[PDB]
Subunit: 477 residues, 4 copies
Amino acid sequence: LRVVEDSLGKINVPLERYYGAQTARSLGNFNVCTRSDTMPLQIVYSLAMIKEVAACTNFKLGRISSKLSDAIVKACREVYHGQHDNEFPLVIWQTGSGTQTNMNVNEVLSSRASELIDGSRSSRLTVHPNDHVNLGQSSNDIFPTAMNLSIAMETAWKVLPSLNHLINVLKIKMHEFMNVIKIGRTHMQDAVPMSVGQELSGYVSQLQQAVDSIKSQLPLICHLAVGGTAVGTGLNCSKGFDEELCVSLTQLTDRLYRTMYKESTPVVDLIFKPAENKFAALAGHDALLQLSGCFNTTATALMRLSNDFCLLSSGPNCGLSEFVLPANEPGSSIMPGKVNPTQCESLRMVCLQIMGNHFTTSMAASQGQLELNVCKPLIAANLLHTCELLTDSTRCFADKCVRDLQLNREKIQEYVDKSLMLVTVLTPHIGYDLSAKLVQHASKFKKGLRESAIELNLLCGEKFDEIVKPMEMAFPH
Amino acid sequence: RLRVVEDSLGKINVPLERYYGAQTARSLGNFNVCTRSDTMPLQIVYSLAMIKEVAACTNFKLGRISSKLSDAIVKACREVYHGQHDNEFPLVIWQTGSGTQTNMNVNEVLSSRASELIDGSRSSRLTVHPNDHVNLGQSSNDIFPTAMNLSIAMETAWKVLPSLNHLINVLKIKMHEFMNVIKIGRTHMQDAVPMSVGQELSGYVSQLQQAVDSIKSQLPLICHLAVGGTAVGTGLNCSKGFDEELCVSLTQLTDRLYRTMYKESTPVVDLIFKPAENKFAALAGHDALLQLSGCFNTTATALMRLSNDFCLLSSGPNCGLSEFVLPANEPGSSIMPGKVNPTQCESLRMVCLQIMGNHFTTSMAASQGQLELNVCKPLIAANLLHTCELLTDSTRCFADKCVRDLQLNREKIQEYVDKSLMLVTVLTPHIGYDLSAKLVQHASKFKKGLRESAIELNLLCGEKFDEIVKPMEMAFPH
Amino acid sequence: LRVVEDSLGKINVPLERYYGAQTARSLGNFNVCTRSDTMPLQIVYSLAMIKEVAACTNFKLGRISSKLSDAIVKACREVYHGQHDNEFPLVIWQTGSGTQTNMNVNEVLSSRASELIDGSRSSRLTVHPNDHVNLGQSSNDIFPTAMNLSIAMETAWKVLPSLNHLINVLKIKMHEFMNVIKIGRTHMQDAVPMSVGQELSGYVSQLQQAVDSIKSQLPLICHLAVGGTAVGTGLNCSKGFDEELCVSLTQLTDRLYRTMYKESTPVVDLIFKPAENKFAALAGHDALLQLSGCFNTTATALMRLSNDFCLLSSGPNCGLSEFVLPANEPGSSIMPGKVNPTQCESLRMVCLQIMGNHFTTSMAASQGQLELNVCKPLIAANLLHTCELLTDSTRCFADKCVRDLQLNREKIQEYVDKSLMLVTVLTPHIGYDLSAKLVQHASKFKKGLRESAIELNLLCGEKFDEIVKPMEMAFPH
Amino acid sequence: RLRVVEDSLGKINVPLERYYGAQTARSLGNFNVCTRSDTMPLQIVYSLAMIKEVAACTNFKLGRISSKLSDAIVKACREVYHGQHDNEFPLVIWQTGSGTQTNMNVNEVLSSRASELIDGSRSSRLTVHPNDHVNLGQSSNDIFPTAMNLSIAMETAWKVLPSLNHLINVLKIKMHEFMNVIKIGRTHMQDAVPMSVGQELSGYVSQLQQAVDSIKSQLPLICHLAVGGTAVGTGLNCSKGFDEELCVSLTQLTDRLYRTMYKESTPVVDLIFKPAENKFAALAGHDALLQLSGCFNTTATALMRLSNDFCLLSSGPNCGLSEFVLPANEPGSSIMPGKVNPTQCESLRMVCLQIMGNHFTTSMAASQGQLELNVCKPLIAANLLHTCELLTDSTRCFADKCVRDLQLNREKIQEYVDKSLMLVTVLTPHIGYDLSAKLVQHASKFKKGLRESAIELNLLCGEKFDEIVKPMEMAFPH
């Protein structure tokens, strides 16, 4: 157990650990779901990235030596390559600025950088957390910068590929079943013929719309608060520091993608720029809430996909039984041989959690107080949870449900034959009023449209077979 | 055409015929926000009129105003809540967050009407002062929350609960009518084991009875009124006993009103008004109303499953489940002739989403307390009263236009009982879960029935099977 | 009382009224908040516009005579110019497709058009609601078309001008007070100097971001379902009807703007195009929910504006008292001469109602069932309520609060003089650790930074006056 | 390294050391969704272990299984809820919506452990079958909702209520310590009339007591368990009396557990488990849990005003209200040295927004019932248990790290009492509202005090004013 000190006095940390007084204090002061609600590591990794480019920029502006800059840079890289995950024990439910996690990163980099320079660990640190590692920075501007950076990388590199994968797997089935005629249902009542491919193209469209909205929003969250310092004025920040750091951060993220993902083109290039208004970048998270809204819309689209796949696979004998979903596992502890649409149920629960995350972000975004919104850790945790949910859940559904989707061709054709709303094609011939008489007749006396149309002397058996052709109704031009 | 009126800020015009004064003319101009559709609910105005009546009587009995004045205020009050002045209240929800301008809107109408009743003529010199007489011993801070609780208590007790009890009672008819009709339960929308249509209907009855019981339990908690707290809850400029006497008189007034409105009828709950134990909490928060909002939120979630289940079970007529036949109340389509839709289900489902949204809005408003006063009061009142009318009208609509004349497709239902392979569930205590699984897998992958599969596999004889496989006995295994 | 008939039998309507059987039935069948929850007239007006261009397009494709087309067209115009508001009594809480309001418009146009042709009103109508007025249309495609059209016009012509007006009034005060130095507050604690203009520029930025998002979303909601008919296949719709109707609707909306608003350029041109995927346009409202999200973000920005104006006008003696808001009315029934920030309280309640409207739309958007989302009237009513709230509330706040905003210059300057976090400029001189000692001293012995800095022999009285200059701290470059 | 396991679908590998079986190996691979952080809460797993214990005992006493088998299941059960197998439960929340895979995850661990306890060695032939023995007379459909209600009942009774009572008790200390310190109330953030700091603190105590009382009242309603309903609520393949005997044994088990955990302690509520009156509603909906979610939502809204009010009142130290001095638990800033922030307020406020969001999520899940089974169960459980831990930890954190050592800036508070012009409110019954308004307008627009303005205007003599203007008497006008 090492001993460290600050303004408030003396406190213990484990001797193995790189974090210091401020981390020790936050550990004890914020004992709220410490087991499960750790600040997301994506925030810690992005803070490490920002401190690296801050070190390089501070050296280029002649504000710090190259001995210090170099040791910090090597410390930063160890953190975002995941060699110090256990140096970050602080929870989401800390200070609303994320100051304590910023100090946590400052203290771990400070002490490690100090170890690399010295060669041993001493009580007197060569690298100061405030004077060196945090130089030209507040938590007020650097925490929002880490929020936007971490969420831009999650969204561009993890979320978009997953959504594109699900779109691509639906497109395979869309084409595979484009010529399979089924009956449309509106208000869950029998409607007119359409193809299975047409129905799948509806989900592809909704998900493509979602992907297009997210791609458009990304460049706007790549506007960074960095350089605003305490209240947005940029006091204690060098002229050009915001612009130079955003250039370096663009190049570091460009290199990082290409180390992580070989022979791939990013779906969107991440070009970081200083925010046009640093006051708005501290006082609000409008651009992150707009992305939250894009994820909310994505969730509502994914909800219909799940619910429609559950409805169309209902059965096997007392339901619709149009769709056959792959059977991945036994369904029931009590009902032997029952197989449930469990990939649909997983996605639907994930979607409700994304929508709830969006309502939480909305309320948190609305709680601005003068110069600083102090719900930042909650906005970060909810958007980063949504990124992981969309990433993992859409890929699960694509691979464990859509990939091996099959049809019950006999049941589907039974529905095409039996829908009374085939009569719809006859309304331009025999009129809307006489078509209703026809359907009312077919229902009462439990007979088909053809037999009924002859029986009421309204259409000849020859004319009926000429007018009513299912596949031509699904594609009428 | 106009009447020059005067406030502490100065003079302004109102139409000659109106009884509303200067602060109403000001509010009207200052808050031009959805003025066509977002008028402060009249239930708040009527409840304020009822409070002003007993407030006058209580102030007279505590020797703070005259019988001449007190008698005049009472008669004007009665004209307002009998609905003889509905055009004297044009202010919107989106006013001051204390509802002060609606309080002063009622103060002015009663001020000037009571003044015309005494003098027998309308002179610009008012005999009854809206602040000194009509608003005597009151703040907007305590009276507007008192009118919120009073308005919502009467809506909830007298309109919402009778509507919910009516829907439960019509569901109970059908529950009894179909208690012995065996259908197949569905879990995960997959075929499961037998149950009765009545057992399935008992599920919605139970959820709706839980909702009624939660609402009946919450009502006496919202009958705790802020009255007597005045500006910040200290009771400054309110005489001792005023709150306790006003609550007794209000209890008696609401008791009389119910028996005027509803003949040969026992109220589902007696509204007994009492002062809140903590007047500071009664001004600074709306916890008791937000708890009632929660009860309505849970009711909406129960009604949502009733809607979605009736839509699902009535799907068809030829390409769906087709267990339920809903009354056909209209033709149904503009292009697909003879198509009838479950429109009563769709109406109720949209209403339930609006109630849940109303609950989310009320939750957010209740969270925005600042020191001594929550200033989102009109928004909380508007959302809660809108939910009361939606619950009242929609549950009765669904009861009378869907459930009352619900019929079954008994042919389709019996088809499902014969074909469900999960009837195998009953064989698990004889051959085990493992060998029961092997059996239904054979029945499924050889398009074969359960009995043929258990013989061909040799798991149970055809006589032993006939013993353990009775659908009516499976729904009521006792 | 006239008598009319349909499939379900015979029913009464008032003899004065133009609506018929389907409207009569919906009146009786959906007795839910009939006093207050009427289907919004903006939906009825947009349905009238669509039926007009449908009549013209049906004639150009040779599918209806010019006698009928012409009478319908004149009927349509009477409705959207507001000469038949009382012919539409149906509520939001009807069928989830809006079929009944579509029939209501069909019946009123049918009967009026029939009156203009005949010259008198007869039981036998010349103009059929289904065969003529609804020709080539379902409620499944025409109700979503009326939703997008009505909300595009509300947003482009009413919402955007109101938001632009509020931005323009904040910009006047932003410039007027750009050189007035005040103290920033973070976590509601004393921070560093900034100008009042800088603080106002934060709200201008957030509202400009909101306006830019809404302008970008409008062209996407101008993609219309029209021509999808029952399930999206376009059965019983003529080839080119969707494309020709969208051309005519673009030109009608262009003319309508210019009759409504003289010597003005629309903020956005409304160019209607057929939706690329008619299935998605029936099964979902993703584009309307994306606009809902833009309105949600706008509400969170307007929330901080309101709450900040309430906080900074707190007083007059026991609060911050930086801002003097115009006194529009007496504040209290009991506390004489008290004046409350009632324009802030109105806007804050409006914003909570917009966010609640967005949560309701989100849940309604998520409830898709196979080919048709049947929560359409609820989505329309909530977005159109939000349009009216944003339109009227932002203009109220702009004109009744921001326009005549004044400052308490003496109180503001007292705060600049007294904030101990002026010490922030000294940390690059005397260090972060020695600056903290300075502030701790100034607090304990209730003395100023200057007197304290000398007393601790840390900075000379001359050097201190040189380093600490408020106006230079707000604009450090 | 691995153990070949077998299900009705086929064979698969698990690590040699693990007690989990085939359906756990399958679920793990099939639902790779936030596997690092969204593990099914262990409270659900422990409650399932407790139910399996009494289920074994009840099945033995009803003559449906052996004492050899029953005794073995009990010992494995105890190892699970004592926390000796936490790494045997790797499945996520985002599994099947019935929680079947977590039910089978517990069935398998108990199956194989009980099998090793009897045989004294782990053979691939299991003496205890997870379906036939451990899951005897049970469905996931009735047992997972039983574990939901049991897990949330114990969290709520034993952790949440003691945390809320602790915060009320620390607020009551300060309420008493400052009952006679006069401050100025603020309505609309404008200066209002005198009140005591203790009166203001009594507002949060009242709101938090209302929350505790609503939660205590809801707890016996969630102790109504789905157990006995099996597949669809009919009780098919459950023996008569099993539910009633299991609930008696569970009551006794939870009673023993409390007294093992907490010494010299009376539970705030006794958990008395009973079968639900309607098993169909107990499977198809979670109305009772959503009502408790509502109670937590209202608690969050009350805690939000406590947070925002403490942040507001502690604003400064030189350019804010500066009435409250919050304990300084840390240095506070990275660039502004000596700046201490109200971090305990910010923590609690973020927690309250998360609880409200959790309530919105739970509301939406509760609305998505389809026929016989709500299949959003893990999501409802996860949200409610997360809210229980947040309420438990955050209210205690705020109590101990903020309220306990709350002090006042008595100088600043007394400045506000002297300067508030709304002290004029007390003069309204003497000179009237109109002439009281004219007075304060003169005092404001001539930078003059109230007494000087009433003399210079001639409204009340300097001696009569000294009679009617006492701040301590204004806060307690009796």
